[PDB]
Amino acid sequence: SHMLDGWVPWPESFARRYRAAGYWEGRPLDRLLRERAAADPDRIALVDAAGDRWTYAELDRHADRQAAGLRRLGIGAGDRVVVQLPNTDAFVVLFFALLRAGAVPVLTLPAHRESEIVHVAETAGATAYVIPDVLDGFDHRALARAARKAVPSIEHVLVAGEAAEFTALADVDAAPVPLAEPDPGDVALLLLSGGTTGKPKLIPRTHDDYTYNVRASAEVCGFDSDTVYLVVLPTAHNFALACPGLLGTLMVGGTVVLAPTPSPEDAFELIEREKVTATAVVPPVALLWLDAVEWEDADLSSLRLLQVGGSKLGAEPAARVRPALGCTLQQVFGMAEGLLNYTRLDDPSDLVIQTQGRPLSPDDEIRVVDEDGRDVAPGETGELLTRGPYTLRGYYRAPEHNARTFSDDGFYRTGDLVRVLPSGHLVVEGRAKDQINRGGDKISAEELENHIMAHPGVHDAAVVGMPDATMGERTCACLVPRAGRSAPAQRELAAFLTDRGVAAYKLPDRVEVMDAFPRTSVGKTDKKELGRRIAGQ
Numbered sequence: 001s002h003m004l005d006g007w008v009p010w011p012e013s014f015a016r017r018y019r020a021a022g023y024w025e026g027r028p029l030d031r032l033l034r035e036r037a038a039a040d041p042d043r044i045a046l047v048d049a050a051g052d053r054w055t056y057a058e059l060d061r062h063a064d065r066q067a068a069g070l071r072r073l074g075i076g077a078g079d080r081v082v083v084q085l086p087n088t089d090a091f092v093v094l095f096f097a098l099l100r101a102g103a104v105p106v107l108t109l110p111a112h113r114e115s116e117i118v119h120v121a122e123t124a125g126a127t128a129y130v131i132p133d134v135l136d137g138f139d140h141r142a143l144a145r146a147a148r149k150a151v152p153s154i155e156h157v158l159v160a161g162e163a164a165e166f167t168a169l170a171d172v173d174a175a176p177v178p179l180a181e182p183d184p185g186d187v188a189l190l191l192l193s194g195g196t197t198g199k200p201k202l203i204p205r206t207h208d209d210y211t212y213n214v215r216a217s218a219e220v221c222g223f224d225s226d227t228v229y230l231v232v233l234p235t236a237h238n239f240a241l242a243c244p245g246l247l248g249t250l251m252v253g254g255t256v257v258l259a260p261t262p263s264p265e266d267a268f269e270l271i272e273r274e275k276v277t278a279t280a281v282v283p284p285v286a287l288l289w290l291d292a293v294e295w296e297d298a299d300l301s302s303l304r305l306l307q308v309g310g311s312k313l314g315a316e317p318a319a320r321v322r323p324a325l326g327c328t329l330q331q332v333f334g335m336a337e338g339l340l341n342y343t344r345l346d347d348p349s350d351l352v353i354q355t356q357g358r359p360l361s362p363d364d365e366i367r368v369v370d371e372d373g374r375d376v377a378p379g380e381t382g383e384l385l386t387r388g389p390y391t392l393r394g395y396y397r398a399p400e401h402n403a404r405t406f407s408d409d410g411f412y413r414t415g416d417l418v419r420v421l422p423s424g425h426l427v428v429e430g431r432a433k434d435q436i437n438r439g440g441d442k443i444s445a446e447e448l449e450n451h452i453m454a455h456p457g458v459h460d461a462a463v464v465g466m467p468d469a470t471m472g473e474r475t476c477a478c479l480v481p482r483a484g485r486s487a488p489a490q491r492e493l494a495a496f497l498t499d500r501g502v503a504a505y506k507l508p509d510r511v512e513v514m515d516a517f518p519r520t521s522v523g524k525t526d527k528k529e530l531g532r533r534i535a536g537q
């Protein structure tokens with residue numbers, strides 16, 4: 001018996017192995033903060049961009065007071081709560097307060113707009129939605145009004161700022177009350193997957209498997225109480241939350257520093273001010289920092305570890321990390337769905353430069369298969385399938401996609417093309433899945449294509465990735481015009497999609513109009529040949 005339905009537990013034989021192995025320790029996720037605050041109450045746990053500062057005892061107490069405040073509002077025991085917050089202390093407090101209240105955080109990104117928020121809110125049956133007031137020029141309270149209109153289950157809107165007619169997040173506060181602990185085998189939080197279908201899919205992560213993800217990652221990356229970690233990616237990104245991210249830093253007793261943006265302006269200042277020792281970035285930001293040290297004066301010497309992942313970092317800039325930034329590079333090839341691959345900190349530089357790591361867990365199982373599902377020969381390229389103690393067995397409330405995406409014996413089809421080296425390290429070679437990787441931001445083609453086809457001048461749309469030297473891929477929208485109507489150009493389509501509620505990183509970089517798409521012999525749109533036509537071949 002589980003608190004939520006709609007997810008796929010591990011078979012009992014696997015659960016037993018993972019507990020017997022010490023991977024699944026049987027502790028709720030919020031207990032990482034409870035135990036650290038008990039052992040190191042007066043250590044500095046959290047620093048925000050302004051310079052404000054909180055000890056472990058202070059953070060633990062505020063999480064209890066906000067958890068009691070959430071319960072007074074009726075948020076708790078299994079309720080799903082959509083969280084959309086910037087890199088501020090409000091996110092860290094509320095994350096633990098929701099866990100202690102028994103609520104299941106549904107983590108979204110600040111860039112997400114009405115179509116993503118409404119979909120995840122109604123899929124999760126969320127009862128509350130947590131937003132900033134105004135963030136980067138956008139008023140999220142209008143979005144909460146639109147979300148509540150489309151999703152009647154949303155009873156409460158909690159606002160980090162001026163709350164308007166809603167509830168101020170700072171007012172969610174009451175005297176701590178004894179709260180029951182969740183079952184560690186239950187879902188702890190729901191992550192948003194980059195997606196390969198028409199709708200974003202939610203990833204359930206349990207207390208046991210997410211704690212192991214965090215704990216094992218902190219060991220591999222050498223996180224301990226000396227670690228000062230700069231959160232450069234959104235706090236809701238799996239990389240910055242758990243790999244080892246801020247949760248790993250808190251679990252071991254280090255200091256979390258919240259960066260408002262990844263710009264050298266904000267990040268380099270915080271690295272010098274707080275003596276940051278570790279951070280994680282996507283490759284486009286790595287390239288920016290590697291350039292920017294040539295004209296920025298910040299003292300970055302305290303930096304010891306730069307994690308780079310989300311897309312493949314080139315071997316040439318990888319080799320520049322030590323001379324330019326004075327720290328160790330760690331390549332990270334991971335996914336919200338589970339499997340994490342890390343280069344080890346003392347790997348020879350050859351493997352740090354040329355590979356995307358080897359799996360985190362001894363019980364991470366990998367297969368590399370050809371187009372027929374058969375295992376490839378050693379060192380051949382094929383699609384990565386994986387199964388392990390923190391990889392999901394199914395998405396949340398997505399039975400049809402689960403039937404397509406997981407093998408009969410529980411292997412998750414990643415859609416990534418890789419080859420495995422004799423040492424066990426992986427090299428990422430490409431992608432099979434119909435999803436564009438734009439600077440670490442994942443764009444489901446079919447989701448974007450369906451939005452574009454809602455435009456009155458568009459009959460059919462095919463979204464195709466184009467190579468980009470610094471961004472990895474950019475997005476080309478190939479359009480068949482509506483009969484007797486003109487298709488829109490790039491700027492009009494961007495405005496249409498933005499008004500529709502599509503996140504800005506999904507807006508096509510380029511529009512190409514054509515009378516028909518090339519098709520295969522089954523009749524599916526041939527995007528390999530669309531790429532050729534886009535390039536004038």
Ligand SMILES: Nc1ncnc2c1ncn2[C@@H]1O[C@@H](COP(=O)(O)OC(=O)c2ccccc2O)[C@@H](O)[C@H]1O
Pocket residue numbers: 193194238239243308309310311312313331332333334335336337356414416428431437442
């Ligand atoms: N170093 C890399 N080199 C080439 N490709 C990479 C890659 N790292 C990710 N990818 C692609 O991203 C994934 C889905 O993305 P994600 O779910 O958003 O999570 C993350 O990126 C993420 C990244 C690091 C740590 C924790 C995470 O969670 C994969 O499937 C693959 O396509």
Ligand SMILES: [Mg+2]
Pocket residue numbers: 300301302303304325326327
């Ligand atoms: Mg250094």
